């Protein structure tokens, strides 16, 4: 039995939150909402994609274009190319952190079923996922 307000799918509980928080804060919020809670993870080739997309579509305010999911760039570097076009390795790096987009979210266009990477400090609504209680 998922807690009230949460929807079930393949043995797990999900909930869309309208509150806008940066990616890191959203993940923390999810972990606080239920033990085992995390920003939603999605198996793109399953019906989980449509299920989560539907949860957002049906509850997100018409003006918000994104909803955070639990995917992030793993790399510590600010950009991921390991070498320049001339073939030399990348060592020195001087990137403007605002153009750094390491946090993923569902995009409104096409029904919140496709992903896009954004500046992690942006505040967006999001979706949490947790094992049943």
């Amino acid at each position: 039995d998922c807690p009230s307000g949460w929807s079930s799918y393949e043995g797990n509980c999900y909930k869309f939150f309208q509150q806008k928080m940066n990616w890191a804060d959203a993940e923390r919020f999810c972990s606080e909402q239920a033990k085992g809670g995390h920003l939603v993870s999605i198996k793109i080739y399953s019906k989980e994609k449509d299920f989560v997309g539907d949860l957002v579509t049906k509850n997100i305010q018409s003006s918000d274009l994104y909803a955070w999911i639990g995917l992030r760039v793993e790399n510590k570097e600010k950009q991921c190319s390991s070498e320049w076009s001339d073939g030399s390795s990348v060592s020195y790096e001087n990137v403007v952190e605002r153009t750094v987009k390491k946090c993923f979210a569902l995009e409104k266009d096409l029904g919140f079923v496709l992903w896009i990477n954004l500046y992690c400090a942006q505040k967006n609504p999001f979706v949490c996922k947790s094992p049943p209680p």
Partner: protein, 121 residues
């Protein structure tokens, strides 16, 4: 031995170009100027300081293409929960440098920008 118009620094040669092209075209263009030439690559803050002194023929507040592309799809990804990532989910973005303070901006590779080419002598 680098031909005229192409300035030099620490064994390499660089040249600013006033053409407005997409990253792909700029890179390609650089390879078709001299054998082995490519969009400029920065291995040190000093090398970037030098190149910055060649962007004289440029408008400002604008950026110049440097040799880094598809910087997001080249990444590794992981979920916050126990789900494993199964290995192109990002847009084709490239790197351009702003010659004021040499900081790098990551933008759509389809933007038309001036650029700097480079090669070894």
């Amino acid at each position: 031995d680098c031909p005229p118009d192409w300035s030099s620094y620490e064994g390499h040669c660089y040249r600013f170009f006033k053409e407005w092209m997409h990253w792909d075209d700029a890179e390609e263009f650089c390879t078709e100027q001299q054998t082995g030439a490519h969009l400029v690559s920065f291995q040190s803050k000093e090398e970037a300081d030098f190149v910055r002194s060649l962007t004289s023929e440029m408008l400002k507040g604008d950026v110049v293409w440097i040799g880094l592309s598809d910087v997001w799809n080249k990444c590794r990804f992981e979920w916050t929960d126990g789900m494993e990532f199964d290995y192109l989910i990002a847009e084709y973005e490239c790197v351009a440098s702003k010659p004021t303070n040499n900081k790098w901006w990551i933008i759509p590779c389809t933007r038309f920008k001036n650029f700097v080419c480079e090669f070894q002598a």
